[PDB]
UniProtKB/Swiss-Prot annotation, chains A, C:
Disulfide bonds: 10-36, 12-52
Coverage span on the entire protein: 54 to 124 of 128
Gene name per UniProt: PPBP
Organism: Homo sapiens (Human)
Protein name (database record): Neutrophil-activating peptide 2(74)
Origin: domain of life: Eukaryota
Length: 71, 64, 71, 64
Protein backbone atom coordinates (compact mmCIF):
# COMPACT_ATOMS: atom_id res chain seq x y z
CA UNK A 1 0.00 0.00 0.00
CA UNK A 2 2.96 2.24 -0.65
CA UNK A 3 2.94 2.82 -4.40
CA UNK A 4 6.10 2.52 -6.41
CA UNK A 5 6.71 5.58 -8.59
CA UNK A 6 4.60 5.55 -11.79
CA UNK A 7 2.82 2.34 -10.68
CA UNK A 8 -0.38 1.31 -12.46
CA UNK A 9 -2.98 -0.37 -10.18
CA UNK A 10 -6.75 -0.84 -10.67
CA UNK A 11 -8.06 0.32 -14.03
CA UNK A 12 -11.82 0.30 -13.39
CA UNK A 13 -13.51 1.96 -10.47
CA UNK A 14 -16.66 2.75 -12.55
CA UNK A 15 -18.22 -0.34 -14.27
CA UNK A 16 -21.34 -1.23 -16.25
CA UNK A 17 -23.35 -4.30 -17.22
CA UNK A 18 -25.04 -2.46 -20.11
CA UNK A 19 -23.19 -3.44 -23.32
CA UNK A 20 -24.41 -5.36 -26.33
CA UNK A 21 -22.29 -8.48 -26.93
CA UNK A 22 -22.42 -8.02 -30.76
CA UNK A 23 -20.27 -4.92 -30.37
CA UNK A 24 -17.49 -6.69 -28.44
CA UNK A 25 -14.37 -7.74 -30.35
CA UNK A 26 -12.56 -9.31 -27.36
CA UNK A 27 -12.76 -9.49 -23.57
CA UNK A 28 -10.01 -9.59 -20.95
CA UNK A 29 -10.68 -10.86 -17.36
CA UNK A 30 -7.92 -9.76 -15.01
CA UNK A 31 -8.01 -11.61 -11.71
CA UNK A 32 -7.14 -10.07 -8.32
CA UNK A 33 -3.46 -9.72 -7.55
CA UNK A 34 -0.66 -7.55 -6.12
CA UNK A 35 -1.47 -4.91 -8.77
CA UNK A 36 -5.17 -4.59 -7.85
CA UNK A 37 -7.38 -6.31 -5.30
CA UNK A 38 -10.56 -6.69 -7.34
CA UNK A 39 -11.37 -8.55 -10.52
CA UNK A 40 -11.58 -6.25 -13.62
CA UNK A 41 -13.19 -7.09 -16.98
CA UNK A 42 -12.30 -4.94 -20.04
CA UNK A 43 -14.30 -5.27 -23.24
CA UNK A 44 -12.56 -4.07 -26.47
CA UNK A 45 -15.14 -2.76 -28.94
CA UNK A 46 -14.93 -3.40 -32.69
CA UNK A 47 -13.83 0.27 -33.09
CA UNK A 48 -10.97 0.00 -30.58
CA UNK A 49 -12.61 1.72 -27.63
CA UNK A 50 -12.57 -0.11 -24.27
CA UNK A 51 -15.11 -0.35 -21.54
CA UNK A 52 -15.05 -1.47 -17.88
CA UNK A 53 -17.64 -4.21 -17.18
CA UNK A 54 -19.05 -5.39 -13.80
CA UNK A 55 -17.68 -8.93 -13.13
CA UNK A 56 -20.38 -9.63 -10.53
CA UNK A 57 -23.28 -8.75 -12.80
CA UNK A 58 -25.34 -11.78 -13.89
CA UNK A 59 -25.71 -10.29 -17.37
CA UNK A 60 -21.91 -10.03 -17.69
CA UNK A 61 -21.38 -13.65 -16.60
CA UNK A 62 -23.83 -14.75 -19.32
CA UNK A 63 -22.18 -12.55 -22.01
CA UNK A 64 -18.85 -14.26 -21.14
CA UNK A 65 -20.32 -17.80 -21.43
CA UNK A 66 -21.97 -17.08 -24.78
CA UNK A 67 -18.68 -15.66 -26.14
CA UNK A 68 -16.88 -18.82 -25.05
CA UNK A 69 -19.58 -20.76 -26.92
CA UNK A 70 -19.28 -18.95 -30.19
CA UNK A 71 -22.55 -17.14 -29.50
CA UNK B 1 -3.15 -12.99 -39.25
CA UNK B 2 -4.95 -16.30 -38.61
CA UNK B 3 -5.53 -18.56 -35.54
CA UNK B 4 -2.87 -18.37 -32.85
CA UNK B 5 -4.10 -21.34 -30.80
CA UNK B 6 -3.60 -24.63 -32.59
CA UNK B 7 -2.97 -26.62 -29.41
CA UNK B 8 -5.24 -26.03 -26.38
CA UNK B 9 -5.43 -27.52 -22.89
CA UNK B 10 -8.17 -28.13 -20.35
CA UNK B 11 -6.32 -29.29 -17.19
CA UNK B 12 -4.72 -26.07 -15.78
CA UNK B 13 -5.45 -25.16 -12.13
CA UNK B 14 -7.03 -21.71 -11.64
CA UNK B 15 -4.54 -20.69 -8.92
CA UNK B 16 -1.96 -20.24 -11.68
CA UNK B 17 -4.02 -18.00 -14.01
CA UNK B 18 -3.62 -14.30 -13.58
CA UNK B 19 -5.73 -13.19 -16.54
CA UNK B 20 -7.65 -14.47 -19.62
CA UNK B 21 -8.39 -13.02 -23.03
CA UNK B 22 -11.35 -14.32 -25.05
CA UNK B 23 -11.40 -13.56 -28.79
CA UNK B 24 -14.32 -14.51 -31.04
CA UNK B 25 -14.15 -16.09 -34.48
CA UNK B 26 -13.08 -14.02 -37.46
CA UNK B 27 -12.46 -14.11 -41.22
CA UNK B 28 -9.06 -15.81 -40.78
CA UNK B 29 -9.87 -17.80 -37.61
CA UNK B 30 -13.08 -19.84 -37.29
CA UNK B 31 -12.72 -20.65 -33.62
CA UNK B 32 -13.02 -18.79 -30.36
CA UNK B 33 -9.58 -18.40 -28.81
CA UNK B 34 -8.97 -18.29 -25.08
CA UNK B 35 -5.42 -17.22 -24.02
CA UNK B 36 -4.57 -17.39 -20.36
CA UNK B 37 -1.62 -15.52 -18.94
CA UNK B 38 0.00 -17.32 -16.00
CA UNK B 39 1.31 -15.68 -12.90
CA UNK B 40 4.78 -16.34 -14.21
CA UNK B 41 4.09 -14.43 -17.48
CA UNK B 42 3.94 -17.57 -19.66
CA UNK B 43 0.88 -17.84 -21.97
CA UNK B 44 -1.42 -20.76 -22.91
CA UNK B 45 -4.44 -21.52 -24.97
CA UNK B 46 -7.47 -23.05 -23.21
CA UNK B 47 -10.18 -25.21 -24.88
CA UNK B 48 -13.31 -22.97 -24.94
CA UNK B 49 -15.73 -25.92 -25.27
CA UNK B 50 -14.51 -28.03 -22.35
CA UNK B 51 -16.77 -27.85 -19.30
CA UNK B 52 -13.66 -27.69 -16.98
CA UNK B 53 -12.61 -24.45 -18.80
CA UNK B 54 -16.10 -22.88 -18.71
CA UNK B 55 -16.05 -23.36 -14.94
CA UNK B 56 -12.49 -22.02 -14.52
CA UNK B 57 -13.61 -18.85 -16.34
CA UNK B 58 -16.64 -18.36 -14.06
CA UNK B 59 -14.46 -18.76 -10.95
CA UNK B 60 -11.88 -16.28 -12.28
CA UNK B 61 -14.74 -13.80 -12.82
CA UNK B 62 -16.04 -14.33 -9.28
CA UNK B 63 -12.75 -13.86 -7.53
CA UNK B 64 -11.97 -17.62 -7.40
CA UNK C 1 -14.76 15.05 -25.89
CA UNK C 2 -17.58 12.46 -25.57
CA UNK C 3 -16.56 9.32 -23.67
CA UNK C 4 -18.86 6.31 -23.55
CA UNK C 5 -20.15 5.43 -20.04
CA UNK C 6 -17.49 3.50 -18.08
CA UNK C 7 -14.97 3.93 -20.94
CA UNK C 8 -11.28 3.24 -20.24
CA UNK C 9 -8.87 5.47 -22.19
CA UNK C 10 -5.19 6.34 -21.37
CA UNK C 11 -3.65 4.37 -18.57
CA UNK C 12 -0.38 6.23 -17.92
CA UNK C 13 -0.39 9.91 -17.31
CA UNK C 14 2.70 9.61 -15.08
CA UNK C 15 5.71 7.76 -16.66
CA UNK C 16 9.33 6.91 -15.75
CA UNK C 17 12.58 5.66 -17.34
CA UNK C 18 14.20 4.58 -14.09
CA UNK C 19 13.68 0.86 -13.92
CA UNK C 20 16.08 -2.07 -13.80
CA UNK C 21 15.62 -4.44 -16.78
CA UNK C 22 16.34 -7.51 -14.66
CA UNK C 23 13.17 -6.86 -12.58
CA UNK C 24 10.91 -6.92 -15.63
CA UNK C 25 8.88 -10.04 -16.39
CA UNK C 26 7.17 -8.79 -19.55
CA UNK C 27 6.55 -5.57 -21.43
CA UNK C 28 3.53 -4.36 -23.28
CA UNK C 29 3.68 -1.56 -25.89
CA UNK C 30 0.27 -0.17 -26.77
CA UNK C 31 0.21 2.02 -29.88
CA UNK C 32 -1.95 5.12 -30.25
CA UNK C 33 -5.56 4.65 -31.28
CA UNK C 34 -9.20 5.54 -30.60
CA UNK C 35 -8.78 4.41 -27.01
CA UNK C 36 -5.90 6.83 -26.31
CA UNK C 37 -3.84 9.18 -28.50
CA UNK C 38 -0.37 8.50 -27.10
CA UNK C 39 1.81 5.42 -26.97
CA UNK C 40 1.86 3.60 -23.60
CA UNK C 41 4.39 1.08 -22.31
CA UNK C 42 3.54 -1.02 -19.22
CA UNK C 43 6.23 -3.18 -17.60
CA UNK C 44 5.01 -6.12 -15.47
CA UNK C 45 7.43 -6.81 -12.63
CA UNK C 46 8.41 -10.28 -11.45
CA UNK C 47 6.09 -9.80 -8.45
CA UNK C 48 3.15 -8.75 -10.57
CA UNK C 49 3.16 -5.01 -9.96
CA UNK C 50 2.98 -2.83 -13.06
CA UNK C 51 4.72 0.37 -13.99
CA UNK C 52 4.23 3.05 -16.71
CA UNK C 53 7.40 3.57 -18.77
CA UNK C 54 8.30 6.59 -20.97
CA UNK C 55 8.35 5.40 -24.67
CA UNK C 56 10.35 8.41 -25.83
CA UNK C 57 13.19 7.88 -23.31
CA UNK C 58 16.42 6.53 -24.90
CA UNK C 59 16.99 4.29 -21.85
CA UNK C 60 13.52 2.64 -22.38
CA UNK C 61 14.09 2.07 -26.12
CA UNK C 62 17.34 0.31 -25.29
CA UNK C 63 15.73 -1.78 -22.59
CA UNK C 64 13.15 -2.97 -25.20
CA UNK C 65 15.95 -3.90 -27.62
CA UNK C 66 17.95 -5.98 -25.12
CA UNK C 67 14.68 -7.78 -24.09
CA UNK C 68 13.99 -8.69 -27.77
CA UNK C 69 17.56 -9.98 -27.93
CA UNK C 70 17.39 -12.16 -24.88
CA UNK C 71 19.13 -9.93 -22.33
CA UNK D 1 2.22 -24.10 -19.85
CA UNK D 2 5.32 -23.52 -21.96
CA UNK D 3 6.23 -21.85 -25.31
CA UNK D 4 3.24 -20.39 -27.05
CA UNK D 5 5.00 -19.32 -30.22
CA UNK D 6 6.03 -22.26 -32.37
CA UNK D 7 5.48 -20.39 -35.62
CA UNK D 8 6.60 -16.76 -35.93
CA UNK D 9 6.65 -14.30 -38.76
CA UNK D 10 8.77 -11.37 -39.86
CA UNK D 11 6.66 -9.73 -42.58
CA UNK D 12 3.68 -7.87 -41.09
CA UNK D 13 3.03 -4.15 -41.64
CA UNK D 14 3.12 -1.92 -38.53
CA UNK D 15 -0.03 -0.18 -39.74
CA UNK D 16 -1.86 -3.37 -38.74
CA UNK D 17 -0.45 -3.74 -35.19
CA UNK D 18 -2.33 -2.29 -32.25
CA UNK D 19 -0.04 -3.56 -29.47
CA UNK D 20 2.86 -5.90 -28.72
CA UNK D 21 3.80 -7.93 -25.68
CA UNK D 22 7.42 -9.06 -25.23
CA UNK D 23 8.02 -12.01 -22.86
CA UNK D 24 11.48 -13.24 -21.90
CA UNK D 25 12.74 -16.77 -21.67
CA UNK D 26 11.64 -18.72 -18.63
CA UNK D 27 12.04 -22.18 -17.09
CA UNK D 28 9.84 -23.78 -19.74
CA UNK D 29 10.22 -21.73 -22.86
CA UNK D 30 13.77 -21.06 -23.97
CA UNK D 31 12.94 -18.29 -26.41
CA UNK D 32 11.84 -14.66 -26.20
CA UNK D 33 8.22 -14.46 -27.34
CA UNK D 34 6.76 -11.45 -29.11
CA UNK D 35 2.91 -11.50 -29.49
CA UNK D 36 1.33 -8.83 -31.67
CA UNK D 37 -2.36 -7.96 -31.40
CA UNK D 38 -3.70 -6.67 -34.73
CA UNK D 39 -6.40 -4.01 -34.98
CA UNK D 40 -8.91 -6.70 -35.76
CA UNK D 41 -8.18 -8.54 -32.48
CA UNK D 42 -6.25 -11.47 -34.03
CA UNK D 43 -2.94 -12.36 -32.41
CA UNK D 44 0.34 -13.38 -34.12
CA UNK D 45 3.83 -14.30 -33.11
CA UNK D 46 6.76 -12.13 -34.41
CA UNK D 47 10.37 -13.32 -34.85
CA UNK D 48 12.35 -11.37 -32.20
CA UNK D 49 15.67 -11.94 -33.98
CA UNK D 50 14.73 -10.52 -37.38
CA UNK D 51 15.92 -6.99 -38.15
CA UNK D 52 12.59 -6.08 -39.78
CA UNK D 53 10.83 -6.91 -36.48
CA UNK D 54 13.38 -5.06 -34.33
CA UNK D 55 12.67 -2.01 -36.47
CA UNK D 56 8.86 -2.39 -36.39
CA UNK D 57 9.05 -2.46 -32.58
CA UNK D 58 11.04 0.79 -32.53
CA UNK D 59 8.54 2.47 -34.88
CA UNK D 60 5.72 1.36 -32.58
CA UNK D 61 7.46 2.80 -29.51
CA UNK D 62 8.02 6.04 -31.46
CA UNK D 63 4.42 6.38 -32.64
CA UNK D 64 4.75 5.39 -36.31
Amino acid sequence: DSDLYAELRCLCIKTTSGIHPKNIQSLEVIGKGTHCNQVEVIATLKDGRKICLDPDAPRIKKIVQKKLAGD
